[model samples]
Target: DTWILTADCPSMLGTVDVVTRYLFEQRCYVTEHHSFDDRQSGRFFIRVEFRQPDDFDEAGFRAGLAERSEAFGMAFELTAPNHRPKVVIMVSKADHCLNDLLYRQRIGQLGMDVVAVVSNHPDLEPLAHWHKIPYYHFALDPKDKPGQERKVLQVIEETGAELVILARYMQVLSPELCRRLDGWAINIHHSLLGFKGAKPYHQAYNKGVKMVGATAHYINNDLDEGPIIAQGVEVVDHSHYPEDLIAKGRDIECLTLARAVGYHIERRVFLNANRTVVL
Candidate 1:
């Protein structure tokens, strides 16, 4: 079986050697490897996919790596081949992103077990039910927004979801919820560069923009301003109207969100300061 190992540490000499040396000593066969030294962040990140030797001792390997990693202040994550992380998806009425993710998960493109689907509206519950995934529909209370978020958080905690995906989940998460989900949630935002607010496609059409795009990023306190994981863009001309732009944008959103989620599941993304290093 192939296992994935990822590590990050402060920028310094021998960061790569530390991991490579340990693997060599352990007789682990490295099949794929990638590393990056971020000059601006002064950080080092590495990802390795390897097959363990016969009679491998998992505990001993972890203990030995821990001992060796301490001096450099490096942190490592090891993922077994069978470790399928539980995921919770949050959505509103939009079905495009949700459909794409569900289809990918069914086809084994994204190695995740989507345990629950939470939404404010009941529109997409049918889609979730078709996948045999539990669906939770919570009504949003304008006066008691936190109360609504509490129920959402309860679902997340109960399911032990390792990743929370805001797949066109229309609600703006509160700071408390964002804090609770920091580094654990991913969101997809429509990127026309600088339209902002509602009906972004219409606004883009009025401005005669030439391009439309989508950004998938980790969720943070700020709205749609997190460490971006993946992006997809499509060119357009003045002849395209608002509806046409929206249609084109949805396609990009689905593809971009799927790519970001794939990266996360494969252990290829590392969260840097306010950005991401995807190996």
Candidate 2:
């Protein structure tokens, strides 16, 4: 059994030692440790996986860590090995990413409890039902997007989901909802960058781009521009048509989105201003 501890703070002396020394004093056996000090952001981030002593004291560990971290303006999170965070997945029609996530969770590749699968359309209801996960199909109200968002938020809050995966949700979230789910939501975007509107793949083909990719990141107010978590790319040539590009892109999107979700579940990501420090 192991416990994962992650912490971040403004860069300062003894930032690393503070965590390491405390674990040593507690007689915890360290298995994995990674830390980074970003000079540009002037921040320190660390992730440690360790086995606690036989007489482990959860409350005492928190108290001691809090006291030591306080001096450096640090914030920390501790996750137990058996803890499976509740997740709410939001999607719209497209099920490649959603399907990939569900499959990984089933095979124990991703450690999460998908409490609810929320979508604006009912097309994927059967898929969710097969997995024995609750499906919510809230019709999008053109006249009142906020009303629809309220229902979505209701499910998230009611389920106590620690994370929200926008698996090709394909809708522009309201600024209010974006802010509310700022750090908690992850989104996957086909890396066709500036090709907005309809037929992004066609636009890419027209531009004769030699490479196609997908990006997974946190959802923010700026549409798909959020703190990047994972990215996957595939090389292409003039021979690949729009349909072929779409097929290739979909595969990359599935892999990239799954990678980002796995990172979040493992508590290996840190939001550093506009960027992320993935340890």
Candidate 3:
């Protein structure tokens, strides 16, 4: 497990030194680090990954960190990495998350490998293939959903995918499919949880709510009803119509889902019952 630290320590000259020395005293080594400075804002941003030595005591680790961070004034976290989850994304037409994911891969922001893209429609073949990932069209006839599930199951089994991302995959999966994947499946709903059905975005617009958002959750037998891993929302006004809301909602969908994927893969998310702690 490595600690993921993010903070701006008042732009102090010895901020990194102060933190690094404390980490060393705790017998922790920095395995990875990313940092930056905002010239206009005079703020420093650092995201560091560190780990304690084998000799360190786990029981008192939290207490030690609490004491240390208080003295330095920094906000950070520690998590056990999930050992790189192998993922298969299921999509249909909409490519907001798919495009965002591919960009993350291109820029080395995502840690896990997206083994393949499974689709009910081949609308995203060009995008998937452009990134050099496998594109699999698992489209089923209108009356043959069971047969479709069989093919998808076979693909999933063959790849041994640890996580399944329904990146707007259109078909409703059967109970058997959901049970097989269980906690390992992750899906991005265009609207936040508690809003049911295939018309979540439009529903939010019609309700005249100020907030429109997206949810990423674990896949379950009940349609879109699973443990929520992450969600994001933004306030809107009467000026924005249903179409306008949908447009902005799509942007939120890409980002919220991407963050959830990163958290899940980096082990920063803890699933307890039907909720998540984003550490």
Best-fitting candidate, scored by lDDT: 1
True-vs-predicted CA distance for residue 64, candidate 1, Å: 1.7
Error of 2 at 112 (Å): 1.3
Write model 1 residue lDDT over 22-106, tens digit each, in one string: 9999998999999999999999999999998998899999999999999999999999878898999999998999999999999
lDDT tens digits by residue: candidate 2, 123-191: 999999999999999998799999999999999999999999999998789999999998889999888
Pitting candidate 1 against candidate 3, the one with the higher lDDT is 1
C-alpha local distance difference test of each model = 0.94, 0.93, 0.76
Colliding residue pairs in candidate 3: none
Model 1, C-alpha of 240: deviation from truth (Å): 2.1
For model 3, what is the error of residue 185's alpha carbon versus the real structure, in angstroms, after optimal superposition? 0.8
Question: Against the correct fold, how does model 1 do in TM-score?
Answer: 0.96
- Superposed by TM-score, candidate 2 places the C-alpha of residue 253 at a distance from the truth, in angstroms, of 0.8
Model 3 lDDT, residue 229, Cα: 83
Task: Tell me how many residue pairs clash in candidate 3.
Answer: 0
Clashing pairs in 1: none
